Amino acid sequence: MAAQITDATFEASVLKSAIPVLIDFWAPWCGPCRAMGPVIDELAAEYEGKVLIVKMNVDDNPATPSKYGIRAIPTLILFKNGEVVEQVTGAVSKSSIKDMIAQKALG
Template sequence: MFLRCTVCGASNELPASTLGAPLRCSRCRQPVPAPAHALVVAATDAKEIVRDAPWSVVVDFWSPASEPSRQAAPEVERLARRHQGHLIVLKVNADIAAEWGRSLGVRSLPTYVLFRQGAEVRRISGPLTAEQLESALIPAG
């Protein structure tokens, strides 16, 4: 997982399993904030993060060719910002990650799948607001 240091701009490769521990930049040693935006990742990286991250992970299966996906993009960003520090939001291009999407039974875009400890917990499809995504995916408390 790559996170950019807000102090020196260095791109840090951090294993997903280190989320939750204080993250430090490998160049300037300053703390690197947890991601406050959706991370665009390939399926292989997404699978690794889903498996290893101690936090809940929402995977947004989207496509640049899908109008509802493009519509929902700012809401996905808001979701990531609102849950910075305990939720990871990943954007996976379903056209490229077609095999993974198929194996999960993703039929329409966007589809949001919530994983915890590598296992699917919930999912919902459609262009939803951050609040709708929260109430559908994130359990209270």
């Protein structure tokens, strides 16, 4: 499952792990950002037990996007071992995110 996590909390679960992880950056003041709610919740259950999934709020955690090279936008990052390999900027459908992770994160 996915949830709303915090900069000091997510690293203790993701960055300390060897599993592939997915971040989604969002804020409640933008439309496609808050509308990712049912998107993340579908795909989070497609990858369960073999992939880690979190969403990161850019109004509550303004340093977390900035250190991954982001401002305050709907963008997702796919990586492993706590170290970036690929990002996806702009909003995308749950169907497109699954069809991508089917090789990227599941291997």
